[PDB]
Each structure stands twice: as structure tokens, then as C-alpha cells.
Design an enzyme around this catalytic site. Structure first.
Site, PDB file in Angstrom:
ATOM      1  N   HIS A 171       0.811  -1.192   0.000  1.00 29.80           N
ATOM      2  CA  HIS A 171       0.000   0.000   0.000  1.00 29.80           C
ATOM      3  C   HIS A 171       0.826   1.214   0.000  1.00 29.80           C
ATOM      4  CE1 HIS A 171       0.820  -0.142   4.075  1.00 29.80           C
ATOM      5  NE2 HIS A 171       0.378   1.173   4.097  1.00 29.80           N
ATOM      6  N   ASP A 221       0.666  -8.203   2.182  1.00 27.89           N
ATOM      7  CA  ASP A 221       1.166  -6.891   1.929  1.00 27.89           C
ATOM      8  C   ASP A 221       2.628  -6.708   2.215  1.00 27.89           C
ATOM      9  OD1 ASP A 221       1.006  -3.684   2.045  1.00 27.89           O
ATOM     10  OD2 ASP A 221       0.227  -3.872   4.015  1.00 27.89           O
ATOM     11  N   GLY A 251       2.810   3.958  14.337  1.00 27.13           N
ATOM     12  CA  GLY A 251       3.314   2.941  13.380  1.00 27.13           C
ATOM     13  C   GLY A 251       3.038   3.409  12.014  1.00 27.13           C
ATOM     14  N   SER A 255       3.142   3.273   7.766  1.00 28.28           N
ATOM     15  CA  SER A 255       3.101   2.035   6.864  1.00 28.28           C
ATOM     16  C   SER A 255       4.510   1.600   6.388  1.00 28.28           C
ATOM     17  CB  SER A 255       2.100   2.738   5.953  1.00 28.28           C
ATOM     18  OG  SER A 255       0.833   2.457   6.349  1.00 28.28           O
ATOM     19  N   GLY A 256       4.724   0.381   6.210  1.00 24.95           N
ATOM     20  CA  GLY A 256       5.835  -0.387   5.728  1.00 24.95           C
ATOM     21  C   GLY A 256       6.775  -0.656   6.919  1.00 24.95           C
TER      22      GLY A 256
END
Length: 226
Positions: free
Chosen positions: A57, A94, A174, A176-177
Site C-alpha cells: 500500500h 502486503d 506505526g 506504513s511499511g
């Protein structure tokens, strides 16, 4: 890997709220990912000098820069490895790997987190950590039952999503990734790649990542070659 030169200082704030901030070099594999104009939207983990693992994403491309650690390395992408069990309607499995065009220059402030085994399990109630910038903070969070989890995220918890937090303290630092890590034989290892969390960012909801262990082998095989 995983045996950082300057050590994560994790307190009580950890436990709590929005959590706290680290001791630089602290989460050494933390990367930022800046966009063509130094805008940061995702950041991710380094396992080596040459690769980032992050979320898909984050939808990250080959003109995004690895920003690591100016005592910094901005590391340009060479190829982006996204992977086909990549479902967005779901956002599952993901995971996306990155080749940087020129190596990561390993030092105290930048290193690599270790990868887990596919068999390895991970314990619900197990105390892992989110690093992020969502100064860079660190918070502490137990993983839970994908069935506990189920009950906190409905239908969107499959094979490979694995959930963590909701314990008074919050998911959302947190970015993303980003990195969700635990222990083994004393290394930190990447368990969960950050998928998503509670809007209101309730300190009473659990946070949801992607589960390495289910994808390691794809890292493994993908890695390898390329």
C-alpha cells in the site's frame, strides 16, 4: 543481524499511550521513504545493505528514496519487488521488497533486522515494538490471536495478517511499511510489516500488520535471485 550497535532504551511510556521516543540508532533498520520531493509517506525495514522490505500500500516506486539513519543515507531505488498475493481489495500478503540502487553502508546508526523462519510461531501476549514517525517514536505492543484480532477487525484478518497492540497504548505511531519486531535468540526480527490501525487511533484497539513468517519464503526465494 538484529544486533544493533546502540541500544533501544525502552521505558514505561512504551507501554503507554502514543508511547515514546527512541535513542537514535535505536531502531537502526528504520527507514523513511521520501517521495521525489523529501516528503515522507512510509518508512520500512532494512535486513541488508541492499534491501527494504515495506508495505505495498505504501505503493512505492523507483523514485522514492531510502532514507537511512547528514549522518544519513538517502538510498535511491533500483527495483521494487511487490508481490502477487498482493491483494488491495484486501491489502493482504502486503509485502514489497526494495533493491536500492547503491548499498546501504553499514554503521552504528544503520543496520539490519533479522528475518524469521516460516515455522517459527509468535506468541500472542508477546511484547514487540513499533518504531515510527506517524521525532521517531517507539511504542510497545503484544501481538494477539488472529481470532482475538478477528473480533477487533472483522473479516479482514487472513492467513498472513497478524495483529498487534490494543493494550492501552497505540498502533498508530506505526507509519506504513513499518517495522513490528520481536525476539529470537536475542535478535530482533521483523514479524509484522505495518498494514493499518484504529482511526480515532484508540488505545483500545489492536493494530494490524503483515506476517512475515508467511512471506519470508517469498522474501527468501525472491531474494535468491534479484
Amino acid at each position: 543481524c538484529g544486533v544493533p550497535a546502540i541500544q533501544p532504551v525502552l521505558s514505561g511510556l512504551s507501554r503507554i499511550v502514543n508511547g515514546e521516543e527512541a535513542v537514535p540508532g535505536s531502531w537502526p533498520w528504520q527507514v523513511s521513504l521520501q517521495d521525489k520531493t523529501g516528503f515522507h509517506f512510509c518508512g520500512g525495514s532494512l535486513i541488508n545493505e541492499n534491501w527494504v522490505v515495506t508495505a505495498a500500500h505504501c505503493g512505492v516506486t523507483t523514485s522514492d528514496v531510502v532514507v537511512a539513519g547528514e549522518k544519513i543515507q538517502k538510498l535511491k531505488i533500483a527495483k521494487v519487488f511487490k508481490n502477487s498475493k498482493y491483494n488491495s481489495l484486501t491489502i493482504n500478503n502486503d509485502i514489497t521488497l526494495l533493491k536500492l540502487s547503491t548499498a546501504a553502508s553499514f554503521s552504528q546508526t544503520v543496520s539490519a533486522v533479522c528475518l524469521p523462519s516460516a515455522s517459527d510461531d509468535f506468541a500472542a501476549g508477546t511484547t514487540c515494538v513499533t518504531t515510527g514517525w506517524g521525532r521517531l517514536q517507539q511504542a510497545s505492543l503484544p501481538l494477539l490471536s488472529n481470532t482475538n484480532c478477528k473480533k477487533y477487525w472483522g473479516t479482514k484478518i487472513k492467513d498472513a495478517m497478524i495483529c498487534a497492540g490494543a493494550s492501552g497504548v497505540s498502533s498508530c505511531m506505526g507509519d506504513s511499511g513499518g517495522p513490528l519486531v520481536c525476539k529470537k535468540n536475542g535478535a530482533w526480527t521483523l514479524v509484522g510489516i505495518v498494514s493499518w490501525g484504529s482511526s480515532t487511533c484508540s488505545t483500545s484497539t489492536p493494530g494490524v500488520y503483515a506476517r512475515v513468517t508467511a512471506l519470508v519464503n517469498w522474501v527468501q526465494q525472491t531474494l535468491a535471485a534479484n
